[PDB]
């Protein structure tokens, strides 16, 4: 069985045409399992539509919209789950397929094997040319509950197009009473198996035609198989061999290439507030999330944070690259039309955890007093660096204290805090613990004088150990 992935263009067309009929085949040809949406729209007149063939089921929904074609080659598509609904409203929706001033549209319905939609509303409304769809009988297939040739005799005043073979297939509504789904006929002993969509060849939960829920190796199930199965006799949760993963409607003993495990489920990617582990936890901390830094990838050209490009900053853990805050960052660049940063949004930092590179402030907000954006930053890697340091802080008249609170490691390249006359706390600071190597050193000079900071109270927290503190409180000890 082929599988493939859906669009989410609703409306949007390619302007040339002829690319968004090159782009409808790509995506659909030799597939047969949709994982997502159908969407054909704004294809003209004259082309091969006959690769919809390979088409059984659809889990998202149905979208045939703006064009121009006589005929929908979806011969054997079977159902539509419509997990996933076009306007939140429809599972099938057919609509404007007509262009003006041209005797160009739809004009039949090839959707002889669609007898099952699992959620969602049909739609089909202004398709000039249409014929035989208004004889349908879509309370048969919804489960919840011009001038136009004619059905044929057979038909019984049912059918998609205008031969003995093109009636409508009914398979729940001249079912007997006692069915709890679908039916193969009309007696009781035609009725499938509950887990049947669609319909079915036999009683069995192995002659459906699509299944309800999922298809564990040809059988309809419920659900898949479990890690562990009750064994009624020991009284215990034995191991189970056959234990398989929820891929959309198929259980699979393995997920496909790159996904990952989100409780017993394949998925693309983990939920948000879970983490990837392949499988998804929730998550211990914030939630990993590794960001360019300035110097990186889509900050290549960057030389500071600023205005323009501390968005990019939203949410990241750990930051590839640098850190780096410069005049022009922090004041606004003239010569340009970058304006100076609004400090508050300095504050999406409080979730970076680790800079693999280095941090440079040769400039800060002159009302900010400290680095608390930092609070939660652990590790300082100096995986690359500036002139040996990984670690500048210089020339701030702003700053009281450091309060990078959580800082625990700087993993290579030395410590310059130099001419930032107002601060205190760094001189209590041992750095020994937080530095690697030997060959790590700190230039420290010309901030406050330890003497005058202890004179005016600022001092560690009793809690602290002898390594020192960050700033005042009992939140900001080393140790
Ligand atoms: C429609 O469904 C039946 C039953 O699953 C299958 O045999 C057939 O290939 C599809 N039918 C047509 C008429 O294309
Ligand atoms: C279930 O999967 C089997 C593969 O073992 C496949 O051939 C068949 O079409 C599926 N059955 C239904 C009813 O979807
Ligand atoms: C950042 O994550 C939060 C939840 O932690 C979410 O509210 C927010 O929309 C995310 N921001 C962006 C720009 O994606
Ligand atoms: C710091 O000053 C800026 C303007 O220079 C302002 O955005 C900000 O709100 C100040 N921070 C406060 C009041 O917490
Ligand atoms: C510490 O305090 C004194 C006295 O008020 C002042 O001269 C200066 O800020 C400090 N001393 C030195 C040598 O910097």
Redesign the pocket.
Known sequence: QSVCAGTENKLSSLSDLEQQYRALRKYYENCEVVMGNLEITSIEHNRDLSFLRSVREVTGYVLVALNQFRYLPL??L?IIRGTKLYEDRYALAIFLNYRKDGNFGLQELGL??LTEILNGGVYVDQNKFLCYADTIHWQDIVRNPSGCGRCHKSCTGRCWGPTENHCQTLTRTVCAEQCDGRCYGPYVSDCCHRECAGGC?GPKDTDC?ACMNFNDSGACVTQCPQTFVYNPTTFQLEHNFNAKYTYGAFCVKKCPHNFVVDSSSCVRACPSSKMEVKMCKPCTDICPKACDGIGTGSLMSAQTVDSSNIDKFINCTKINGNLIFLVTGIHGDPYNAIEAIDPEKLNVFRTVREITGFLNIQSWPPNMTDFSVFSNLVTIGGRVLYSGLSLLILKQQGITSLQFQSLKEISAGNIYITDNSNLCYYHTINWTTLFSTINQRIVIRDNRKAENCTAEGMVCNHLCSSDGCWGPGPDQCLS
């Open positions: 011969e054997n079977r002889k094997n060849s035609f």
